[PDB]
Amino acid sequence: MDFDVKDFGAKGDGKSDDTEAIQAAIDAAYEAGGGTVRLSAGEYRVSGGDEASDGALMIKSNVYMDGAGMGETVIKLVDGWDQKLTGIIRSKNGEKTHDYGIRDLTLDGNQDNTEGEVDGFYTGYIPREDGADYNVTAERVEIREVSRYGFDPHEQTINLTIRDSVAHNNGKDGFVGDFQIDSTFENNVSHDNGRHGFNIVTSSHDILLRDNVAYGNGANGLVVQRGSEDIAHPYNIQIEGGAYHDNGAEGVLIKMTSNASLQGAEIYGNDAAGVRVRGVDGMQLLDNDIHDNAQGGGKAEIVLEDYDDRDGVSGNYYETLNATVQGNRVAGAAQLLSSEGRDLLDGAAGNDLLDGGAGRDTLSGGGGADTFRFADRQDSFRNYEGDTSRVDDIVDFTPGADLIDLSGLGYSGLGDGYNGTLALLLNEDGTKTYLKDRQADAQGNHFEIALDGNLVDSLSATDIAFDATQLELLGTTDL
Ligand SMILES: [Ca+2]
Ligand SMILES: [Ca+2]
Ligand SMILES: [Ca+2]
Ligand SMILES: [Ca+2]
Ligand SMILES: [Ca+2]
Ligand SMILES: [Ca+2]
Ligand SMILES: [Ca+2]
Numbered sequence: 001m002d003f004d005v006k007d008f009g010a011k012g013d014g015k016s017d018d019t020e021a022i023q024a025a026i027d028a029a030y031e032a033g034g035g036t037v038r039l040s041a042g043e044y045r046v047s048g049g050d051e052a053s054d055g056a057l058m059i060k061s062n063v064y065m066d067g068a069g070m071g072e073t074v075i076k077l078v079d080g081w082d083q084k085l086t087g088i089i090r091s092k093n094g095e096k097t098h099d100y101g102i103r104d105l106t107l108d109g110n111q112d113n114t115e116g117e118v119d120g121f122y123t124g125y126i127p128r129e130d131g132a133d134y135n136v137t138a139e140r141v142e143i144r145e146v147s148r149y150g151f152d153p154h155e156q157t158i159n160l161t162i163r164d165s166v167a168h169n170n171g172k173d174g175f176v177g178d179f180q181i182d183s184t185f186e187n188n189v190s191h192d193n194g195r196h197g198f199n200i201v202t203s204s205h206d207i208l209l210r211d212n213v214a215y216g217n218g219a220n221g222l223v224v225q226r227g228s229e230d231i232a233h234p235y236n237i238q239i240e241g242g243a244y245h246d247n248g249a250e251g252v253l254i255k256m257t258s259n260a261s262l263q264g265a266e267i268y269g270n271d272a273a274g275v276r277v278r279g280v281d282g283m284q285l286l287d288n289d290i291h292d293n294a295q296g297g298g299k300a301e302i303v304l305e306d307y308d309d310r311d312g313v314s315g316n317y318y319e320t321l322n323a324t325v326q327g328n329r330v331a332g333a334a335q336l337l338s339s340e341g342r343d344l345l346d347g348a349a350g351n352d353l354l355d356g357g358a359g360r361d362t363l364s365g366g367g368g369a370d371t372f373r374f375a376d377r378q379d380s381f382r383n384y385e386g387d388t389s390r391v392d393d394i395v396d397f398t399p400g401a402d403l404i405d406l407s408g409l410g411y412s413g414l415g416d417g418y419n420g421t422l423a424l425l426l427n428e429d430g431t432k433t434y435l436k437d438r439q440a441d442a443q444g445n446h447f448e449i450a451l452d453g454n455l456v457d458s459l460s461a462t463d464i465a466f467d468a469t470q471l472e473l474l475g476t477t478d479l
């Protein structure tokens with residue numbers, strides 16, 4: 001059978017302290033080897049213990065707590081509590097608790113009637129040490145009015161799944177995954193939180209974020225970040241679907257992360273850029289709908305940039321690398337900058353800036369007047385003796401609108417390809433146009449740019465900026 005807290009003396013009347021009865025039900029379920037602790041409809045008042053790590057209710061291995069539904073079963077911190085409480089429901093610190101979860105209930109932090117930092121649901125083994133909770137589940141759970149963190153799974157947790165859950169009106173973050181491994185957040189809503197809707201931090205890796213919605217938060221709707229500690233970066237973070245809109249900061253912020261992907265999401269109405277990527281080694285930005293961002297100021301809907309933490313906790317400089325930005329609808333300017341490696345960068349209807357950096361890159365501007373910047377002669381070249389092509393190709397250059405920014409390369413204009421000029425040439429097929437420097441460097445490399453189509457007769461000098469003054473007069477972007 002199931003274990004009913006009201007059979008253990010829980011009143012569920014909104015005043016009596018039901019902590020002991022709920023914990024007795026949990027302990028009885030544990031003694032039998034596992035089970036379900038069921039709470040009928042009602043408001044159950046709970047309190048904490050002697051220490052912060054005691055939380056309020058200590059859930060245990062093989063024990064699931066199952067209420068009557070969000071707003072129907074409410075576990076609410078007692079009025080006047082003035083003690084920091086790390087997890088109204090939590091597992092034990094120093095124990096690798098496993099195969100437990102919470103279903104069909106509301107956790108209420110009673111922040112209006114209590115003092116101190118309170119978190120709703122807390123998991124993990126020990127900060128900074130090895131060992132993990134595993135097989136943790138939260139389904140159809142609402143966490144509200146906690147002072148710091150609504151859902152705060154922590155270090156370490158393996159195979160956590162939070163689904164169909166809501167976190168709202170919490171102090172800092174509705175959902176925060178700290179060192180989650182092989183974990184899934186799906187079909188959740190995080191809104192009206194103090195700082196973040198969703199926060200993936202502290203070396204979390206192999207995380208799926210599917211069809212989540214974040215709005216009304218004081219900062220990012222979703223942030224994937226290393227954190228404030230000198231620790232390993234998160235990696236393998238796959239965001240699919242969902243919406244991140246009307247937040248006080250960027251819709252989606254990804255910084256100091258490896259192999260992150262954001263696909264199929266709707267990102268609009270945010271105060272900062274819709275998508276901001278800072279020092280990410282491996283970033284896929286695919287088939288998103290990004291519009292009407294930067295509502296509190298800013299010039300870009302999408303920002304790709306590095307992160308200089310040389311004066312920070314790590315002392316390192318992190319370059320954004322290995323970017324594939326394709327298929328997005330972006331109703332504004334996109335700053336698509338990358339570095340060494342092959343990058344595929346596609347703009348949208350806005351006035352975009354594209355620079356793939358070193359390596360062989362494929363650039364396309366889409367609609368609007370787009371600037372394609374080439375900042376170094378080593379960033380696009382062909383070696384004829386080796387018959388090796390490392391030539392950036394521009395897919396859809398439009399001479400009447402787009403601009404090639406070569407202002408820092410020391411070329412003076414079009415010509416025969418020697419002595420500071422670039423030769424405008426057509427391939428023998430008529431399908432490709434080339435801007436070629438016919439002078440080889442010491443390594444036998446020729447600086448070249450490939451443009452798909454036949455542009456020998458329409459591409460002119462005013463389409464290329466050869467120095468700083470020409471860039472000043474011809475610039476197509478505010479970036
Ligand atoms: Ca239920
Ligand atoms: Ca534990
Ligand atoms: Ca464009
Ligand atoms: Ca590149
Ligand atoms: Ca264009
Ligand atoms: Ca060279
Ligand atoms: Ca390049």
